[PDB]
Design a protein around this nucleic acid. Structure first.
Ligand SMILES: [Zn+2]
Lengths: 96, 217, 25, 115, 87, 97, 206, 129
RNA sequence: AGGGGAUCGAAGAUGAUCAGAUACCGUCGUAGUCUUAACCAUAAACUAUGCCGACUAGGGAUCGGGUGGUGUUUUUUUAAUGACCCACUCGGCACCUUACGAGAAAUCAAAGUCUUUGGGUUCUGGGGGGAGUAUGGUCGCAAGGCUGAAACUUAAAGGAAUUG
């Protein structure tokens, strides 16, 4: 039983099932598709440099309530205009 | 100033029975807890967990506490109690009493050739309590216990030194994790072994031997 | 909404999409 | 309703259990009996107890109660149980065919008959 | 379960069932020990003498305790021709 | 879950069975379903039997009957109280009271 | 091993056959096929009285050898077994539980009915199935006057008698009492019969 | 259809011993079944098996004695080398001292201790304890 | 496409209720409902339970077949026959009790013989939405079928049972 094959010669079938279900996996699909290059805001790199275009105070989500004080920046190497939250208190007073 | 209430209690108070070895041996029912109060001095406890359960009533919200507490001396006997009570203190107290009622023997073994007072389990063992399968693998000397903190403290109370502990299912529920480990430690003597293959003369029930110290007053 | 009526909605939407895509040569 | 409670009912069953021959069938006599032979803190509650006692006494004289028994009832039941008639020949044993085959294969004498 | 110097360990030895020879647990509160009488000549079952049997909870619950008792009693001579080996 | 092991009403090996129509609401309910009852009445109920016998020719001839087989949807069955919602443990009972 | 004085004794065989104990029920319950001897036509099954008496003497040898012979407990919930158990109890120790059982009477050490026996005897296992279960919980043998279509679960030694006649039930109780007394008891000379009549262990109308 | 007569024999035996039977009628038989039972018998896990010889394939009646916890088959019959015998033992036997892995070597059907001694290996068959 | 078109009846028309009522209720009625010749190819197409094989637990019914009975009723004198009864048997659709086991539980003699994991084999699933969507393919007269993503967003969604 157990639904899979168990014959001594079914390595091909086992291998191919594994290869077909790794796509139903999540993180493996992203790795092989290569979203970190073809689509992601960064080029898959760990950091990225930008030019501060504008400063957006955006309201948080419920049930909280606050302004979050981020900056709408544009990446230098790609050209995707993203939004970067700013860390601890006043750092928006620091970023022009 | 405890007084015995049952036949077995009469015997253990009259000191004619002095070993839970013999109690388990004859699979006698431990109805009082004072008997092992006598029969396992130095028996230390450990309150594994306290958690609130709630019932949703007409107007209010009836909260009571379920306390899970393990007990053991340190050498080959453990018991586990669960209790539900309106207050945490009474909960722990009655949990200790129920644990002492449910003390159970564990069979320690070797991971290889026998040398100096078995350290580990006798065989791989498994216990399942509602979707939590705790499995215990023997281990060589000096490997210690490798398990979750709760099962590790429980097996440490049991006295097994070296155990490999697989696990499966939603272990996050400590009640069921400890219940599973308890069924595993029971299945320890559950298993039959080429050592135990031999024959015995089937001992003769201290109830039946001392029946006269066992009648009423 | 009910899965059956949602299916019928997406059916009519698919029909309209096909129609405009066919009008677009 | 006039549905008397466990206090009076248990008290009445017990007093009839331990004072059956002294108790009587009259309400006033039973009442005074309770007065002298009970420590009860109300004339009203005593009257309720005594009334249920007379009622139970009537149904006890008419028949047995499922609830309570006395020394007298215990004695008469002892003897009624001890009665024994002559045990269960009419000649040979009764109708038996395959059980007769049983007794032949088992090896008895057993004067019996056919069926 | 002895140790290096041939010395015994394993704090106690369990009693094994007499129907299937399976270990009778400590928590098997269904496990039962029948003690029949050794009868000397002319009735008068001498007190203090037991032909001991140990029946397990599994056998008793599955309901073959009477079968196993009949077989064991005949095997130890307690009965004469109540249990047949070939059903 | 599965409120009933017989899946509501008994098929167990057909696959399809022709449906009948309820008698109150006329709803096409399968025939294995459709609470079925037998109405065996007299035409001339004892509210009027003696009247008829008093006023009738053919002395003591007979009294005929009306036989009807009623099929009921489950909705109208419960509504007209031919059947009632039972306890979870007495659902398994099949015998007719 | 049991000496040749302990055979069926055609007199007791007459008693059994006259009380009509050899009759069973129409359903066999294969766990009792050994005890069945033959199938009577017109749908009746004939219990083997030989095995009946042998199992009775075995059960008597079990009911003896209890050092404090009162700690035997004898249960009966039928009507046809109540006077039987009362008289059996009166003779041996055998604390009787007649009528209803008040369950939790072997566990629950604080009840007033809390017996803690080392053996039980049940007249009808199907209707005393609560006492059977309690004995299961607290580790106790069973000696039961079972019928053929009687549940053999959690029952130790069984005596197939009738469970459908007054005479069968009472007379099996009577013979068991006699045999347990004769095992040591005080009834010397097994070859001499017993004075007490089975009418004692019969239930009047009343 | 019947694919692994040995697997079915061992499964019948396991079921009978779990039920608490004393003997079991296996069908059909085979040389590998006879040899497997012989290994078991040598180590003490079963009693006596009587091979009823009808003309077709034979049947076996195996009088047990308890003391056999679980017998099973490993299918397919993987090729175990002498270095991987240990991995198999450690993966499907309870403790390092009892219980036997049963290989099918070119020296006959044997246990894993006999296998380590004669220093041969081959197709794994099953296991007993 | 052709025939036939009684009944019921999508659409539609109208009457009432309603705050409204493009609906429920009421009268009418088109396609349809039926058949022949061709298409489609999906359904809660359900036993939400793949097919083959082996073993494990009792019980009573019942359908088809088969064996046995110095059994019951039947012709006209009792054989044959038929049907019924009893015991068993093979294959079925199911059913009653237990939990021996399994399960998260509801519950299951198969959803058992699974941590003491391996009888053979096919297909499918990998948190919820977007989504059975877009697109490309292929089949179809068409409706549509099969195949089938992503960008993005989210900490839940869900199953079984308990107390309200
Ligand atoms: Zn209806």
């Amino acid at each position: 039983g157990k639904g899979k094959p168990r014959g001594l010669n079914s390595a091909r079938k086992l291998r191919v099932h594994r290869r077909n279900n790794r796509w139903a996996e999540n993180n493996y699909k992203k790795r092989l598709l290569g979203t970190a290059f073809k689509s992601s805001p960064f080029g898959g790199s760990s950091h990225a440099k930008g030019i501060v275009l504008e400063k957006l105070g955006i309201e948080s989500k419920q049930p909280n309530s606050a302004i979050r004080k981020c900056v709408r920046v544009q990446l230098i190497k790609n050209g995707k205009k993203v939004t970067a939250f700013v860390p601890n208190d006043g750092c928006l007073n620091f970023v022009d | 100033g405890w007084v015995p209430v049952t036949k077995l209690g009469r015997l253990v108070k009259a000191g004619k029975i002095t070993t839970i070895e013999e109690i388990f041996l004859h699979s006698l029912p431990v109805k009082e807890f004072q008997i092992i109060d006598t029969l396992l001095p130095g028996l230390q406890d450990e309150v594994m967990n306290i958690k609130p359960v709630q019932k949703q009533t007409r107007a209010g919200q009836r909260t009571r506490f379920k306390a899970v507490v393990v007990v053991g001396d340190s050498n080959g006997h453990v018991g586990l109690g669960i209790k539900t009570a309106k207050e945490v203190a009474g909960a722990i107290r009655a949990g200790i009493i129920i644990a002492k009622l449910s003390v159970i023997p564990i069979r320690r073994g070797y991971w290889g050739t026998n040398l100096g007072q078995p350290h580990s389990l006798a065989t791989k063992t498994t216990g399942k309590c509602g979707s939590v399968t705790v499995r215990l693998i023997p281990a060589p000397r000096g490997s210690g216990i490798v398990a979750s903190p709760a099962v590790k403290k429980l097996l440490q109370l049991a006295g097994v030194e070296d155990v490999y502990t697989q696990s499966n299912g939603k272990t996050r529920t400590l009640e069921n994790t400890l219940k599973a480990a308890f069924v595993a430690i029971g299945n320890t003597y559950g298993f039959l072994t080429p050592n135990l293959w031999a024959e015995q003369p089937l001992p003769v029930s201290p109830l039946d031997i001392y029946s006269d110290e066992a009648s009423a007053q | 909404m009910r899965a059956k009526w949602r299916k019928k909605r997406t059916r009519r939407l698919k029909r309209k999409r096909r129609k405009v895509r066919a009008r677009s040569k | 309703g006039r549905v008397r409670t466990k206090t009076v009912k248990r008290a009445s069953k017990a007093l009839i259990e331990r004072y059956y021959p002294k108790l009587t069938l009259d309400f006033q006599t039973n009442k005074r009996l309770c007065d002298e032979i009970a420590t009860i803190q109300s004339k009203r509650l005593r009257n309720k107890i005594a009334g249920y006692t007379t009622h139970l006494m009537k149904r006890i004289q008419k028949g047995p109660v499922r609830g309570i028994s006395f020394k007298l009832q215990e004695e008469e039941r002892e003897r009624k149980d001890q009665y024994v008639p002559e045990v269960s020949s009419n000649g040979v044993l009764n109708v038996d065919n395959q059980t007769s085959d049983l007794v032949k294969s088992l090896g008895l004498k057993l004067p019996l008959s056919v069926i | 379960m002895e140790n290096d110097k041939g010395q015994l360990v394993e704090l106690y030895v369990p009693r094994k069932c007499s129907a299937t020879n399976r270990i009778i647990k400590a928590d098997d509160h269904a496990s039962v020990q029948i003690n029949v009488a050794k009868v000397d000549e002319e009735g008068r079952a001498i007190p203090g003498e037991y032909v001991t049997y140990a029946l397990s909870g599994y056998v008793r619950s599955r309901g073959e305790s009477d079968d196993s008792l009949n077989r064991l009693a005949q095997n130890d001579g307690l009965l004469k021709n109540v249990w047949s080996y070939s059903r | 879950p599965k409120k009933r092991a017989s899946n509501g009403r008994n098929k167990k090996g057909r696959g399809h069975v022709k449906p009948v129509r309820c008698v109150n609401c006329s709803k096409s309910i399968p025939k294995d379903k459709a609470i079925k009852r037998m109405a065996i009445r007299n035409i001339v109920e004892a509210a009027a039997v003696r009247d008829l016998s008093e006023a009738s020719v053919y002395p003591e001839y007979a009294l005929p009957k009306t036989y009807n087989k009623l099929h009921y949807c489950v909705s109208c069955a419960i509504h007209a109280r031919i059947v009632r919602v039972r306890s979870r443990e007495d659902r398994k009972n099949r015998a007719p009271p | 091993s049991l000496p040749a004085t302990f055979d069926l004794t055609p007199e007791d065989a007459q008693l059994l056959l006259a009380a009509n104990t050899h009759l069973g029920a129409r359903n066999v319950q294969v766990h009792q096929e050994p005890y069945v001897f033959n199938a009577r036509p017109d749908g009746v099954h004939v219990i083997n009285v030989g095995k009946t008496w042998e199992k009775l003497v075995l059960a008597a040898r079990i009911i003896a050898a209890i050092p404090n012979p009162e700690d035997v407990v004898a249960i009966s919930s039928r009507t046809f077994g109540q006077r039987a158990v009362l008289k059996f109890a009166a003779h041996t120790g055998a604390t009787p539980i007649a009528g209803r059982f008040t369950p939790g009477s072997f566990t629950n050490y604080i009840t007033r009915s809390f017996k803690e026996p080392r053996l039980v005897i049940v007249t009808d296992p199907r209707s005393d199935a609560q006492a059977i279960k309690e004995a299961s919980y607290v580790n106790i043998p069973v000696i039961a006057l079972t019928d053929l279509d009687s549940p053999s679960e959690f029952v130790d030694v069984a005596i197939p008698c009738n469970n459908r006649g007054k005479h069968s039930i009472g007379l099996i109780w009577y013979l068991l009492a006699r045999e347990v007394l004769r095992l040591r008891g005080a009834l010397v000379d097994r070859t001499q019969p017993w004075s007490i009549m089975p009418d004692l262990y019969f239930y009047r109308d009343p | 259809t019947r694919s692994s007569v040995l697997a079915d024999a061992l499964n019948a035996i396991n079921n009978a011993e779990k039920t608490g039977k004393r003997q079991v009628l296996i069908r059909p038989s085979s040389k590998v079944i006879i040899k497997f039972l012989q290994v078991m018998q040598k180590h003490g896990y079963i009693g006596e098996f009587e091979y009823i010889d009808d003309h077709r394939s034979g049947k076996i009646v195996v009088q047990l004695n308890g003391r056999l916890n679980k017998c099973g088959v490993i299918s397919p019959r993987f090729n175990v080398k002498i270095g991987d015998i240990e991995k198999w033992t450690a993966n499907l036997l309870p403790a390092r001292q009892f219980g036997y892995v049963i290989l099918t070597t070119s020296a006959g059907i044997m246990d894993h201790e006999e296998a380590r001694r004669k220093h041969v290996s081959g197709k794994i068959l099953g296991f007993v304890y």
